[PDB]
Amino acid sequence: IRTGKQYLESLNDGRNVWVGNEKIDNVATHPKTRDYAQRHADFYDLHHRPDLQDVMTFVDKDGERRTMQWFGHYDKEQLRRKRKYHETIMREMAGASFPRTPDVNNYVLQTYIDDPSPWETQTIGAEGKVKAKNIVDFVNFAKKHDLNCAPQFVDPQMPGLRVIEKNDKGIVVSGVKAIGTGVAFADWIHIGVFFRPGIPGDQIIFAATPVNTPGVTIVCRESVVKEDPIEHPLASQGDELDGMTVFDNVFIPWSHVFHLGNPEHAKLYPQRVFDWLHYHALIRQSVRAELMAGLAILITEHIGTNKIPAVQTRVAKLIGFHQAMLAHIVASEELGFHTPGGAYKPNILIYDFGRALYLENFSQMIYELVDLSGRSALIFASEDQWNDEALNGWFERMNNGPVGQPHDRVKIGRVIRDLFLTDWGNRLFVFENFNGTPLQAIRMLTMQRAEFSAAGPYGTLARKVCGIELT
Amino acid sequence: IRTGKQYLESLNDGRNVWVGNEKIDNVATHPKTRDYAQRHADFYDLHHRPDLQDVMTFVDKDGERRTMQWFGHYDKEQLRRKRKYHETIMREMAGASFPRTPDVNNYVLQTYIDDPSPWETQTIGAEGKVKAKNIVDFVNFAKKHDLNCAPQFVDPQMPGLRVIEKNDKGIVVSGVKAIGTGVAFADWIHIGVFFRPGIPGDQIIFAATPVNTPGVTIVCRESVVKEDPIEHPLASQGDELDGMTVFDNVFIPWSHVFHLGNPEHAKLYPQRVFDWLHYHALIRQSVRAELMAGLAILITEHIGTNKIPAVQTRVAKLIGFHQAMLAHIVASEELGFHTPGGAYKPNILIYDFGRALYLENFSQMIYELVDLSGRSALIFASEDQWNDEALNGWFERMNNGPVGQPHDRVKIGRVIRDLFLTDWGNRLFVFENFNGTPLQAIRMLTMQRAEFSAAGPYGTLARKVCGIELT
Amino acid sequence: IRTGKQYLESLNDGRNVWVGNEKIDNVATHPKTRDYAQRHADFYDLHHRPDLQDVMTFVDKDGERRTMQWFGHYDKEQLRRKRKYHETIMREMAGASFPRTPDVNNYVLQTYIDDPSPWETQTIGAEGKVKAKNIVDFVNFAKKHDLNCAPQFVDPQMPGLRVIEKNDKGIVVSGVKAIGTGVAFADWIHIGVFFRPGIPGDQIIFAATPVNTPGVTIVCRESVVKEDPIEHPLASQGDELDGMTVFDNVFIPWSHVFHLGNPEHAKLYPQRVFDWLHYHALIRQSVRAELMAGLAILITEHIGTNKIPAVQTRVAKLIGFHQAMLAHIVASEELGFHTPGGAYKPNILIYDFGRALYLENFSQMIYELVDLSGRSALIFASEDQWNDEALNGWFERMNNGPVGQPHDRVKIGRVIRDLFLTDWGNRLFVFENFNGTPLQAIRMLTMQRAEFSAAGPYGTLARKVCGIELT
Amino acid sequence: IRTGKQYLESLNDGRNVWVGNEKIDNVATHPKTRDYAQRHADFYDLHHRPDLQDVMTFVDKDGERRTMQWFGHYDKEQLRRKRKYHETIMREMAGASFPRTPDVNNYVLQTYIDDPSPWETQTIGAEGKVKAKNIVDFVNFAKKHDLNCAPQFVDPQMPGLRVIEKNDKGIVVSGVKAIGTGVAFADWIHIGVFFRPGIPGDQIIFAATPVNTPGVTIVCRESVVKEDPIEHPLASQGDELDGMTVFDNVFIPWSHVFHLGNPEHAKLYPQRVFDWLHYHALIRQSVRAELMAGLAILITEHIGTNKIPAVQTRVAKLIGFHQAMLAHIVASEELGFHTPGGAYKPNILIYDFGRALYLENFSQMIYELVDLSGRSALIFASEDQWNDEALNGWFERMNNGPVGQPHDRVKIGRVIRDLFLTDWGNRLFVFENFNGTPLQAIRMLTMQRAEFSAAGPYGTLARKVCGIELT
């Protein structure tokens, strides 16, 4: 039900935001932030598109219509409904150029809904002031208004956020949340933490607070959004800003506290929370792969190198790369399971491996596409050069191919340039490794699963072939 | 339901065979052949295993019980049942060490009985002498008797097989089939050919003839069976020979010819025949990967290196390789289609990309496992050394670890040796590139599919992101 | 003797230049071009540095002092003197960020000097108006004034530059030179061409003409130089612009013509010309590698991950990468030869292979460094954020390491960002493949050398081991 | 100058030896040992080759003529002369197929005679019982008689060798040396050890004892010599056995102990001892690569695939692999240094990086060659098949190409088979990772060098580009 207009309205709420060397008066209108804010506007609007109601919305138990980003899936086909929703969104929005739209941010909160209690029961030293029902109500609240709750669970390296005081009203926290994406554009900050060896319980904190909370400062890297939307058809659409959040004696009422103290809790449940983001990331990676492969096809075709055998095998490897993501998504969904609350989850082991595959090869694949695109990477016309009466004829002669109009090669060059050769595109590059646990982490925790031990069920085939042990 | 004993008897039919410098009087008993012969006999016997009845057999339309190698699948469920059959055989037989067991050779016959008429329809030099019913009758015959029909299509690179004469009794062919596997162990030779630029119609032959047919000579590489089965538990189980088949005026009755003359037919139909072998190669490939990963886990666990991060990382890498194959299989079965005769076939594009992913990496994955095993690969006790009173105490002290008995290290090493460090193991290495179209072919072939053209459906996302219209 | 001042002066000469959508009135002062122009100014100035006279200059035969960019080397130690010169330059100028300083552009002209005649004698249909002595004088002239002769030999894909008219005064040419680097900043355009299958002799053209020649238009991509030199300590120093050059009925007097017509000539001699640029490129690649490895060291040290074993091996691979370039440079020089004019040339086969090595791996190496640098890639402070009284303390706490001051991590982040995550840095990325023949081309012409044939001297060892042929 | 005949006689000294399950009465004559024994005898004989006198021998200070294995090099020229020796031996002997010929085993002795005193100086449990002169005297002795002294340092992974007793006649040691190569073929065992965390001083032993010493047992892997030398021209030349050596109260006179007790000495001195083996491993590695590239050229030429671009590319890839090794060798010799005793040593960092580059790629390079050979790898005529009247004409038609005789294909295939597809070939595969510190060790070790520290000289370029001072 929420509109881009309401959302844009809400932006101007006093929130304290740096973007580079500058303070931002109003995120909705400031030149450094307005485009990305409009993309979030577009997100809400897209749910009101009449031809999209089938995909974008569903009808809650209470009879109310809600956006699909709050939709629980209890079987495989519902799971696939959820993915069709996420895909549709990222397909409309610059081919997955914006990995943290609110559907991704809020997906994660399905874990609380599914099983609120342990967050309450496992909470150490809050004298039963943490109340599972609070979490549940908060999410319902977020569902009701379509609030965008940016998650922040990543802490500094070896200043972390900590409770400095507790009382009958709530808590006061102080410190920094080291990594956050698009928080300046959100409604709530969703506080979390991951277990680390020797972490203190006053740093074990799960909670929510509005972006404009007194004492909160959002501190973001400089925006790298482009001015000219013809030269930069993608990079001009907004910069999904990354930064940290700073907490100066910030008060959180008990009703927005989710769990405190128990480091035991903080090792499995936070992962349970993030599994949904990990799964989205794979979905996204698949789309980015399909995009890359398509660009390969278009460019090699327009230049006319596509039937050169050495080029063909190169374009196939890009298509294969896409297919490898797709296959892990589909397999994971095929071999999923049910969580405590009965929600259907895709196979964690499989989709994370799908991510490992992406994170291990995406760099080289980008290289292949760029390389295939040759001089059309750096050197091509600006629009005024192309339309100049004296230059235009030389230009059409130099970009004449077997398909489309010559100027099409420039359309393709602009997309490749923005996606892979600009600050804007390169942020997304770097971010791939922060959009969920990174490659080496994925492989490590894999090796923790008991199932991969010597006597474990996985290496059953190996022991038989070697004639070892048994029973 | 044929038995091993019956099979072994069937071998003494006077077929003439070279294994290296030696003619073979009886493949069933010759010291260079008898083990692998026994492996095939074991294959028939597995179907009489009371505890494998459910996996190994099916009851057909007529209440007739038959081996699952003859099972047709019109369902994802059914296909899946066939996979489990193939997998089961492979896990019982030296872990996928025997790539051309009859269940595989006969798999391709499905294509014929699915859609036999165009085979007859399209023949040139016909005279209605080529009859579809003969093709069906033959397979049905092969079915009743559990006949092993080894496929031989691949030709000498740029002397193939050709029709010298054709009367109304049958045809006469001379020439050679360059590559065949275990033909010396089959019952019948399945003749065929692939289209190539400028192929004479007198070389478009699909037929079948017994292995001992007059004018036929099977010419095999030397055998690399190992004598000592303690030292060589796998390599001593027998050598699946490769070689050529020579046809010297070989006569074939019209009852046994399936197509002649039309090289257009040779384009896509022989490929349909082999889609099944390719899919099986993927099944087998994942089993191989599962074994490899298993071994890595056993050896690092037994040595005690398994918890070194940089080691963990590598074992997870191998587990990922397996999950990747499994993902393509499962995904391809999810998104399969129906052939003209109604059989359900997994997505060719996907399962073929799964093979490419394997052919592209197995060499490096194999090296990963070998490196991981250190000296335990190379130097290890022979059995008599182990048991020697003076040596034994030294060997035991040197092979002690956190897991199992010190001698289990020798057991593990022996398997890794046979698999990857012997003539025996290495023929499987080189053979992978011949169990279907090689990696380059897969890649060339996908870029011929029309959907990957600039205006194809595949590039729609990219055309849209670029603001480009086709058409 | 020439100064940056004189050079900057010369810039304002009427030359016709587009940079993006804009016409440039004066390359020396325009905001889009002034920084890179000042870098060329700095180049000339650096030769007047008293402490550098040993390296930057030498004394000609005529007793005159000249810059080392005109210095012929006749033995190994003189060769190494030349490299010490090129290195010194690229070491002073933003760690090899500017691959086409004039020393590189002009190096190539040593091939004419060394052997002028064939250019004259092989010229077809110029009625002996092409005169080797002209080439020689031109170069002397360029040596005398330290002119910067930007080379342009690359033609459009499949508009090329052609002679449209010849006469007693000279020639008129029309067409486009497709790729050119920093031509807007040069003094002369050095025209050339490489042989291609089925190239017409009216397109075989070697010559020189001033940048501001009537009829010449330089058409460059948009400048991506940064405004803020604190946030962007490298990208703010200027953009080495790439573009094409357009010739509208441009007249070249015979005295600046070098060769015409003979396509035979155009297959070996142009390569002979470019060998010097190829060699420089390897020298440059080595420096860029040493830079990357150093950054790896600095960043892993400041964060404190350097002694983590998995990180150590990663930093070593970067150092190894540097060493691989260095080793090819040193070997090539060790095993060099003499050209017709007696100049000492490093081993072509070896240094090109050094380039192949770089071009094949540089993408992954950059990836390794970026990845190693973690969040310091995207998220770090702008200077005003860092110095803010309220933020400064949180910031120093989050960037506290075992070495240097916390703010040092930001210095390192700025360099990594500019070098690998900006339009500016990414141009250099793409350009690596245009700075000499690309990877696949290197490998192809390798396979043309007669020495690599079957009977050739290279595979002598293989024939002996196989017992094949001989004498 | 020792002869082969003398060597073979020397073998029948009653040394006790296991090769697999068998004790060996006379290594010189035993069917499992005699070929490799003959290879060593051939090695001595090469030095009497009249036409190899110049490469194989040198005249020393005293006008004494000696084998180049005993040559000390104080010059780049001299080092280079020694390289040519090593290379020559390798090219005469199955192309580097025998990694542990005596010239290699004895190479490490140079370190002793270069700088013997600290070996004595540093001993603990001394009593001046350990004398440097004995070390020098021994090597000089080994020199006069051309003694093969096999080095054994590597220990059992976490039972090594230990001193039980020490009187004033000598010492008594028990334990086992885990890895040795061709010890059963040597004259003397060269005892040594590497430092490791927490190593008892009674395990710091450097000494030498005859192979047939009482209490010594050489325990070797089964031998994989091939019988038929037509079919197996390389693998039939003999198996360089690997295994362990057991010491059961072995007595060693003080004349023959080189150091005891001090594990600090064990740090960098044993490494100095092996610097020479490592450098030789590089020499050998390039020869191996040269052979591989040679074979690729022969097989693609003979098959006629050699001019397919995508094939050209791959062969150039293999030629590049060879040039890369050659470059590190040549470069490392250019930038070598002088040891304490004055010997000239090539740059360790460089030549060790050359080994890493090899260990990192040889597996994939090997696969490249094997793939390139197609079926010609696997299936090919045995000799008797080739010569058979009926078969012969078929075989010849099938092996015809643009180059050589059709049978040369078989010759090529046989070598590629032995080299990479047999137990014999594969032990060389696995052994590469043991001919010196493995790839991980090389990498770990360079990051210990102080020059790679943040403030080290190496990172100066980067510190300067970042505007950072050290510290």
Residue numbers in the entry:
A (entry chain A), B (entry chain B), C (entry chain A), D (entry chain B): 2 to 159, 171 to 483
Pull text from the paper:
The first enzyme in the 2,4,6-TCP degradation pathway of C. necator JMP134, 2,4,6-TCP 4-monooxygenase (TcpA), is responsible for the conversion of 2,4,6-TCP to 6-chloro-2-hydroxy-p-hydroquinone (6-CHQ). TcpA converts 2,4,6-TCP to 2,6-DiCBQ by oxidative reaction, followed by removing another chlorine by hydrolytic reaction, producing 6-chloro-2-hydroxy-p-hydroquinone. 2,4,6-Trichlorophenol-4-monoxygenase is a unique enzyme that catalyzes the sequential dechlorination of 2,4,6-TCP to 6,-CHQ in a single active site through both oxydative and hydrolytic reactions.
Recombinant TcpA from C. necator JMP134 was crystallized in the space group C2, with cell dimensions of a = 107.07 Å, b = 180.05 Å, c = 110.20 Å, β = 97.87 and there were four TcpA molecules in the asymmetric unit. The individual TcpA molecules consisted of fourteen β-strands and eighteen α-helices and could be divided into three sequential segments based on their constituent secondary structural elements. All the nine β-strands in the second segment, β4-β12, were arranged in such a way to appear almost like a β-barrel. Another noticeable structural feature was that three long α-helices, α10, α11 and α12, and three short helices, α15, α16 and α17, which were all from the C-terminal segment, formed a sizeable helix bundle together with two short α-helices from the first segment, α4 and α5. Applying a two-fold symmetry operation to one of the two dimers in the asymmetric unit generates one tightly associated tetramer in a non-crystallographic D2 symmetric assembly. The tetrameric nature of TcpA in solution was confirmed by the elution profile and molecular weight estimates from a multi-angle laser light scattering (MALLS) experiment. The observed tetramer interface had an extensive network of inter-subunit interaction among the C-terminal α-helices. In the apo-structure of TcpA, a unique entry site and binding pocket for FADH2 were clearly distinguishable. The perimeter of the widely open entry site was made with three flexible loops: (i) between β4 and β5; (ii) between β7 and β8; and (iii) between α16 and α17. A structural alignment of both TcpA and TftD showed that the global structure of the two enzymes were quite similar with an r.m.s.d. of 0.78 between Cα atoms.
